[PDB]
From a paper:
However, in the [name] active site, we observed an external l-propargylglycine-ketimine, which is an analogue of the external Cys-ketimine intermediate that can be formed by both l-Cys and d-Cys. This l-propargylglycine-ketimine was structurally similar to a l-propargylglycine bound to the class II [name] SufS from Bacillus subtilis. Therefore, we used our structure to model either an l-Cys-ketimine or a d-Cys-ketimine into the active centre of [name]. In creating these models, we superimposed the N-Cα-C(O) backbone of l-Cys or d-Cys on that of l-propargylglycine. In the case of l-Cys-ketimine, the Cys sulfur was located in close proximity to both the strictly conserved proton-abstracting His156NFS1 (2.9 Å)46 and the persulfide-accepting Cys381NFS1 (2.8 Å). In our [name] model, the d-Cys-ketimine sulfur was positioned in the almost opposite direction compared with l-Cys-ketimine, pointing towards Lys258NFS1. As a consequence, the sulfur was located far from both His156NFS1 and Cys381NFS1 (3.6 Å and 5.4 Å, respectively), thus making sulfur transfer to Cys381NFS1 both catalytically and sterically unfavourable. We conclude that the altered location of the d-Cys sulfur is incompatible with sulfur mobilization and persulfidation. In summary, [name] readily and efficiently forms the Cys-ketimine intermediate with both l-Cys and d-Cys but steric hindrance in the case of d-Cys prevents subsequent sulfur transfer to the acceptor Cys381NFS1.
Residue numbers in the entry:
A (entry chain B): 2 to 85
B (entry chain D): 34 to 159
C (entry chain C): 3 to 76
D (entry chain A): 55 to 454
Write the structure that this text describes.
């Protein structure tokens, strides 16, 4: 059986590191914040089945982040006034 | 507002202020209405030879109204009272490259010039 | 000073710089959980433009261990 | 050069990356026509369409059979208002709406008036909220439809939709709500609210432009006469090729909004309070348009006395904002919404709209607040109205 804790902490790191590569400020800042908030909100779930559902969703979303980071680098634009 | 020429009169303001209404050498034009979104106050200071030597403005209005009245205030300086009378709305609009929906701004700025100049002429009659 | 390591750890963990002692464990002494320590390791990576892989990150459980890792990687 | 902050989410939203990710397979390899019945490009396109339909239905508490896809909330509003009125025109000639509805509702009602229908345009209170008892009194024996929007796009006020549905249900009058600014942002349940028709827009909820839906209740059966003639797609209610990538995007945006709604509402509420309170404590004569007790926090409409709203937008050169409206008569001719809630005409010229959404950051809010404070002060120092009030003149006493 795979360790949910090992999976969870490794997804957490991967998801944060990949989200930080979003070229666009509003996706990048949203993704990092949302990942941090969601893992923390779900920290106390105890049902092994619900945990696995949350892990599977996180893996799905990590795929989304990888693909959308790369698309946003192919079609990037200038930064916002406030990244100055 | 989008044109560089219009925005410049807000980002690099010139002649914003007031002159002394009670002066016999100061004319004040106050045109427009708050309910129409455009109110311009234009004041001219005229020397004893009839040359406008200074001017100030305040405007409540969109950027083109601010730019039209700011331009008008620059343009009256150094003109005699009779010369300033020939500044037209269409000169202001051409200089600022105003679109048709903002042509009303240049017309109000010409109204402000003529109001200021008429208040001044009223004061000289005695 | 590379002890900027202390600034990051206090920032990340919400503990006064006074409490961030060279001996302290993030979990046992400073109240971190394992989500905090993932982020803390990443903040050190960002702060010192260094890449900290898992087998090294796993050993960085105290203030000094973080100070020593950063000093030994330029 | 560097780009402005986006604070204009009531005009449209960025695509959520999860929504673009769900759409892109249908833009690349799954390009079939969902009505092509004889092959796998058709079958897989149809299946994606039907999954999207269920995603929309689940967000609002509907049966997927009640979801009709359209090109946007404008088209959905036309279908609901003209389609109901024309279906019952031989028995019912009267409709009710409000004076603050979006232009597509108002213009649809105006076109029906040129068709010989009677329309009551209800006033709203100064809060922006209708008076339920005035609605009740306005319903006539030939009233076929009431249409009242859920959240106002210019001032963010929430109409009492569930209470309106109670009134309409009990009189057997159909109740339509334009929910374009509410779907995915506040809870909507068609059965608890007793809604008969509802308009939905994809690009108000981080989905793609060019797509929408209309909910049409099937029990009790609501009847609508179709406006777009054609091949009978969408149960005869909306002919034309259903655009699979767009409806996939709309369903994905609805499912994302269903998951994210509560988290977004808590974050936007906090940012909204921060923006309003920090502007108001640093500037005198700032008034919020619309009742804060019945208000969606992501749409903030403030007036800044003695400063004209378009000059303030120009001054705020690195923030994308608006003066409201159908991206049209907002500050040009003053907002008819601000006029309907009794705003003085000069103050309606002084109003601007701030939008906070799912991706807005606290830093963006603070930057916007800081710049708004600086430029309102600057514009007031350039304003003859401010100069006069500072010299103790009453502006209500000048002959303009
Ligand atoms: P540590 O203190 O030793 O342990 C931390 C964990 C969470 C591993 C520990 O507390 C634990 O095991 N808890 C049991 C419950 C659990 O595992 N919770 C986490 C489940 S996984 C999860 O919650 C992921 C949610 C994913 C959200 C992603 C948002 C994506 C946005 C992208 C948009 C562009
Ligand atoms: C769009 C936009 C701007 C926004 N209001 C528009 C909207 C619509 C129109 O929907 P679409 O046709 O899908 O674009 C219909 N009803 C409402 C309530 C809104 O908000 C604005 O800038 O005010
Ligand atoms: O992690 C985050 O919250 C997002 N960004 C911070 C956003 N930045 C903008 C930038 O990096 O240009 C903040 C700013 O400069 O306002 C981190 C990163 O750069 O990887």
């Amino acid at each position: 059986a795979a360790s949910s804790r090992a999976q969870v902490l490794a997804l957490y790191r991967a998801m944060l590191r990949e989200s930080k590569r979003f070229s666009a400020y509003n996706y990048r800042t949203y993704a990092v914040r949302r990942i941090r908030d969601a893992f923390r909100e779900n920290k106390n779930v105890k049902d092994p089945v619900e945990i696995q559902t949350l892990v599977n969703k996180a893996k799905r979303d990590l795929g989304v982040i990888r693909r959308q980071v790369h698309i946003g680098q192919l079609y990037s634009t200038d930064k916002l006034i406030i990244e100055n | 507002a989008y044109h560089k020429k219009v925005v410049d009169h807000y980002e690099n303001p010139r002649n914003v202020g007031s002159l002394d209404k009670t002066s016999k050498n100061v004319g004040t034009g106050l045109v427009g209405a708050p309910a129409c979104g455009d109110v311009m106050k234009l004041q001219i200071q005229v020397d004893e030879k009839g040359k406008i030597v200074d001017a100030r403005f305040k405007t409540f209005g969109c950027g083109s109204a601010i730019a039209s009245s700011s331009l008008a205030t620059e343009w009256v300086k150094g003109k005699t009272v009779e010369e300033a009378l020939t500044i037209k709305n269409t000169d202001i609009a051409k200089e600022l490259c105003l679109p048709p929906v903002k042509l009303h701004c240049s017309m109000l700025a010409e109204d402000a010039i003529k109001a200021a100049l008429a208040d001044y002429k009223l004061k000289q009659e005695p | 000073i590379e002890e900027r390591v202390k600034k990051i750890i206090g920032e990340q963990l919400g503990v006064k710089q006074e409490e961030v002692t060279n001996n302290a464990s993030f979990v046992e002494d400073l109240g971190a959980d394992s989500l905090d320590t993932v982020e803390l390791v990443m903040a050190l990576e960002e702060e010192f433009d260094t890449e900290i892989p898992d087998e090294e990150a796993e050993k960085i459980t105290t203030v000094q261990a973080a100070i020593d890792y950063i000093n030994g990687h330029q | 050069s560097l780009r402005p902050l986006y604070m204009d989410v009531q005009a449209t939203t960025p695509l959520d990356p999860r929504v673009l990710d769900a759409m892109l397979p249908y833009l690349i390899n799954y390009y079939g026509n969902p009505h092509s019945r004889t092959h796998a490009y058709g079958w897989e396109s149809e299946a994606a369409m039907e999954r999207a339909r269920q995603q929309v239905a689940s967000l609002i508490g509907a049966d997927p059979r009640e979801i009709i896809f359209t090109s946007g909330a404008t088209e959905s509003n036309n279908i609901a208002i003209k389609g109901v009125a024309r279906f019952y025109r031989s028995r019912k000639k009267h409709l009710i709406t409000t004076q603050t509805e979006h232009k597509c509702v108002l213009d649809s009602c105006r076109s029906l008036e040129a068709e010989g229908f009677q329309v009551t345009y209800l006033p709203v209170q100064k809060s922006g909220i209708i008076d339920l008892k005035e609605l009740e009194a306005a319903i006539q024996p030939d009233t076929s439809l009431v249409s009242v929007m859920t959240v106002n796009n210019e001032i963010g006020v929430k109409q009492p939709i569930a209470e309106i549905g109670r009134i309409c249900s009990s009189r057997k009058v159909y109740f339509h709500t334009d929910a374009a600014q509410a779907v995915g942002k506040i809870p909507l349940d068609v059965n608890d609210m007793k809604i008969d028709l509802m308009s939905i827009s994809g690009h108000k909820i981080y989905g793609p432009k060019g797509v929408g839906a209309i909910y049409i209740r099937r029990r009790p059966r609501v009847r609508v006469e179709a406006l777009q003639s054609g091949g009978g797609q969408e149960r005869g209610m909306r002919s034309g090729t259903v655009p699979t990538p767009l409806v996939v995007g709309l369903g994905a945006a609805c499912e994302v909004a269903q998951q994210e709604m509560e988290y977004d509402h808590k974050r936007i509420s906090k940012l909204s309070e921060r923006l309003i309170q920090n502007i108001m404590k640093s500037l005198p004569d700032v008034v919020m348009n619309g009742d804060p007790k019945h208000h969606y926090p992501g749409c903030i409409n403030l007036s800044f006395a003695y400063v004209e709203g378009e000059s303030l937008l120009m001054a705020l050169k690195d923030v994308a904002l608006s003066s409201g409206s159908a991206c049209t008569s907002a500050s040009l001719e003053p907002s008819y919404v601000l006029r309907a809630i009794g705003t003085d005409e000069d103050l309606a010229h002084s109003s601007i709209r701030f939008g906070i959404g799912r991706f807005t950051t606290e830093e963006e809010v603070d930057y916007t607040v800081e710049k708004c404070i600086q430029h309102v002060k600057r514009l007031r120092e350039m304003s003859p109205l401010w100069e006069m009030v500072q010299d103790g003149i009453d502006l209500k006493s000048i002959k303009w």
